[PDB]
Amino acid sequence: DIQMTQSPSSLSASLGGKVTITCKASQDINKYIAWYQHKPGKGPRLLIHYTSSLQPGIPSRFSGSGSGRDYSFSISNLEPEDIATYYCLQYDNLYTFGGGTKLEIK
Amino acid sequence: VKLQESGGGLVQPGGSLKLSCAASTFSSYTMSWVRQTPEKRLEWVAYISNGGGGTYYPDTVKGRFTISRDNAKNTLYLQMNSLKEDTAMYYCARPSRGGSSYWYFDVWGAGTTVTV
Amino acid sequence: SIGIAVILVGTSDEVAIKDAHEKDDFHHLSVVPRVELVAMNETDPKSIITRICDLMSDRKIQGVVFADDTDQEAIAQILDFISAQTLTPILGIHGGSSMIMADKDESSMFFQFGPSIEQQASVMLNIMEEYDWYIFSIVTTYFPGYQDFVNKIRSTIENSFVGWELEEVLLLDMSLDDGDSKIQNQLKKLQSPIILLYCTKEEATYIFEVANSVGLTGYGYTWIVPSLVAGDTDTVPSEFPTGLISVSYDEWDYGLPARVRDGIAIITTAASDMLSEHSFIPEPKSSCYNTHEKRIYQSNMLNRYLINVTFEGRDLSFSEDGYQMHPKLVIILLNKERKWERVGKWKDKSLQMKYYVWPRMDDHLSIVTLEEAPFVIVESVDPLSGTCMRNTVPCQKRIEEPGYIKKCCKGFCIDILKKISKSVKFTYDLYLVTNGKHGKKINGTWNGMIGEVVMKRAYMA
């Protein structure tokens, strides 16, 4: 089956910085992308659809671009109720997942 | 419709713990669930279709796991064996737009832990 | 996985259509479907194509199922063009495409309708072999593809036992639609009881005015009014008497979501056949305006697979463009100024019709008889046709059961009655006695044939 690998290992940024995390799968995904964020012990929150379509209730702080099998997802202007950890999903075959990173604030 | 997990534990070292997530229409809705690493990674566990068929896993927990579901009580059933190096939290997630296919959920569960 | 897109255009209920398929458990198969709904107030051709191929890049769509509230004679024929351009299957029943006959391409991947127009003529033959109706006249205008059709129903000879009885085909040019100097000079052949008429609704609206102008009204009815050509029973003008005898499958579709689920099962079965025999999934096309060649050569195994697939006791082997052998067919009853409905049943060879008499715009007798030596001989029916050739009678024997099979009667008195019928004017209702007590008087009453005489049952004996 297809396997994914996110990267790398860190979200070291200040209040209102800029970070970007990459969806990297083993096979062509045709922009099959999602993005989730959660606190430790709270539960995920949907971000992103096919064309980086954001969610009602999710602010415009989150954008992204990419295609084929490689996607980038950028977070900026971050308020610390989003102390979270960001994760990418592909569903070409049934579901796919990689590593992903956690957020720290300095 | 809301999702609520139950059956949390890892009380036998190397045992088998059938966890579940009940729902309150889920019969045309597939199921696949998530453990969390100390690196918090939302790694996949199993795959069922809405109709009980399509029994699959990712490469992490293959070879040991016995899988089923019941759309009458709206619950999942899978025994955890190879989570024995993790202090994981598990939640259930019901993917949107129904079918035997998969789509993008906002329909996730509540989140409960499995601790050894 | 494979990609199946459904599109509905025009006002419909996508909930019953959604719910019908999402309970169909397509497991026990190797591949599973992928539905995609798209609605409907947008009705230009270019928007339709540029919407289909507008989508066709994000999702792997293997094809499109469109709808029954459009007019498909127009746009839809170009589907075989785009189909051969895209190598993707398109099925369906729907809309204005009611039995479309054309010279579609060889590399198109699409089947549609149900029976052919000649298989329709074959069931029209089984209809005329129910009441031994014999064609005295055919009248068809010069369509681009009518005259071959009639010259094939003409060349489908019927072997004797029966009158083969053509006597006139009539091709009339409706360009020069002079109903005075053309339709009058082509008539006079209407002194005959059966006239076939294969046309469209608008030119029937013209030609029924011409037929009313000459006097083709009384005579009763004028015979074949093919429903599948000019299919709008609700808004047909009616400038004639009753009409609408004929056949379509177009029962108001109790089965339309079942047709969608059956078609999905057909596609999934074909893909399962490809996975059982070769296993490889051809990837669907991903564009329309850009790099439009899109893995240009593809295995022609799918056209062969689209025909070899059948669904359990229901779907037929799908060979001629979409012209099947035994789909369910219906028969319609008979007035257009009072929107009458279906009165017949057809299933896979058989016809069941619940009128039994021809209306006409008292000489009807019941007649009760008795089997004996060679005056009224009772024999069984043919095991291939049901009816009787030389015997020419029902003899509806009761068991009661006036639906017991119409046993053939021969002999001398029947040959006398068949001359006496043409002698004055008759109509039979021929049946046998049941109590078996012909010509007997017991205390109070009579039995048998005289028993059905004393019971005043509109009789002869």
Place this chain on the structure above:
Amino acid sequence: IQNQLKKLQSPIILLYCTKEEATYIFEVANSVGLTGYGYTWIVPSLVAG
């Protein structure tokens, strides 16, 4: 005259009338198509002389 026809598919038709009403009825017979067929048979000379 149209409802009384259709009996003209036959080769012999007798017609006993006057000249003026024949002038009317021959227009009606031309209007229906009673031309070819050849001739229409008895044209009694002594009436419309």
Place this chain on the structure above:
Amino acid sequence: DIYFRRQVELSTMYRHMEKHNYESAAEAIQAVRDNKLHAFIWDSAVLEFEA
């Protein structure tokens, strides 16, 4: 078989003929002499020689 299917008055006879026909002349000629077939119809210029 052409003369019988052409005729309408003999049609019932032909319908009785459809279940017992043979493929060759000698087959029916031998089958008449074995009393399995009481009669046979063919041309005079062969049957009058065979008799």
Place this chain on the structure above:
Amino acid sequence: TGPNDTSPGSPRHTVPQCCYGFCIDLLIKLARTMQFTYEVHLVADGKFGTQERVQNSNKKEWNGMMGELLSGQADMIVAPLTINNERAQYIEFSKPFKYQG
């Protein structure tokens, strides 16, 4: 040249056979009269030629011998072949040898 179906079930083995009789003697006289080189090969099945609607379609082929006359397998038929209205639609005959019934 005999048929391939020398034993009229399965096998197909054509052999040189030998013939003699009435039509052979008259053919001898006609070939000697009209300078004919000729070959004689027997028929496929032995069903005298008839017409029927075959292949559940609008096609009427001629079974047996007359189809082989129509298909160019021969150019003359010298056999006890009767005269009918249906065979003589497009097949020219001669003055017919005999009178029988």
Place this chain on the structure above:
Amino acid sequence: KIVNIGAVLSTRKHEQMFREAVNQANKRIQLQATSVTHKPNAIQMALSVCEDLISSQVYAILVSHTPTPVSYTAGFYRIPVLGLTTRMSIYSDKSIHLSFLRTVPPYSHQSSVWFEMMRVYNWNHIILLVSDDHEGRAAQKRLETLLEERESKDNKRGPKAEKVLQFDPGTKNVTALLMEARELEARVIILSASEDDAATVYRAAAMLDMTGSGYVWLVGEREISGNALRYAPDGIIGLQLINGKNESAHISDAVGVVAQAVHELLEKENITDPPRGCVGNTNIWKTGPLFKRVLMSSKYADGVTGRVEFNEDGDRKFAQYSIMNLQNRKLVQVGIYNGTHVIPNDRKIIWPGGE
């Protein structure tokens, strides 16, 4: 009263022929202009339909010289008959197009051109090779419509041919069919196939020596390309149409027959107009049959090189030919054709192979 004129192919002929043609038809009743060329093939050229038709299709249908996709897209909208100098055989299919009219005879229309050959050099032994396409069946139907003539009431009504074949294996098998066709005594060959199939029957006739003496060949249109494809020395007879390569004479006779049709339609009263755009609209417009009527009832002697007429299907009705034959590798021109007249020669016929 300022009509429009469409065009589809390329930017040399739009410059003559278009600004000059609006001024030519302005003597009638005024015209102007929009035109485009359509550079890619399938469906990208079908994409740009009704980017030009937004107000052109009230008064003009784009016309010019595989020519088949845009005719299907812009033939949906109840679009009357167009004359375009194509190579559509499939233009006698009057349901699937309400819009075609040839200005050049099709691939099958060489058949009556053959039928007039039956009189001069009356020969009655013909093997006619015919491909298994729909084109071949159409040509077959036309040549059988030609065979079913001379029904009154001198040894024959005409030459009825030996037989025809069907010939599915174009690129695979010619030897078995030709081995059977050698036996039939006929010496006249009618061959209607592709030019690569002509370069193939170049093999099997040379191996069977069925190209020598007596063997008269009657090829279709796509044998004059085959001389390049490497086809056998002489006695083959071929035909060739008057200019279909000097397209200025075509666009000129096109502008003459459309100026006559615009002037003929402009003199009437109930010329209702189609709606504009293609924005959800249906151009269901009662003067469509009237366009066919106005074209079908007028002649067309106007032009530069010859009388051009139109049939009920949309053919030219006239057969103007230079007839060639390759006399040792070169196409010498022999007499010419003109409908029903004589074929006036000016050269000598060799004869096939030896003699």
